[PDB]
Amino acid sequence: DGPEKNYEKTMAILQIEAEKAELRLKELEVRRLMRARGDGPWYQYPTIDKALIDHSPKTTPDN
């Protein structure tokens, strides 16, 4: 084929691979920050559910 076909295919491939590399670095930074802070949807280790607490009159008045 023409020399321009390989040129444009190479440009598309380079764009895709550069986007992949940037996304990989972004993902690594995001994962590190989420693990360090725990303020995102990832690394949300479970805690005690507050629906188990019994909010009813107990025996002793001081609860």
Place this chain on the structure above:
Amino acid sequence: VLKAAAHHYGAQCDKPNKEFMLCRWEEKDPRRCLEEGKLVNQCALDFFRQ
């Protein structure tokens, strides 16, 4: 002595005793219901006086 008069004591001194119980079970602090606790003894003494 308290147990013998307990049934009548609960009926006659119901009003001040229930207020103190509500206070203790809403404040959850004995220092926030001392005044209501004093009224329990005053009504309890008045119950035995009769």
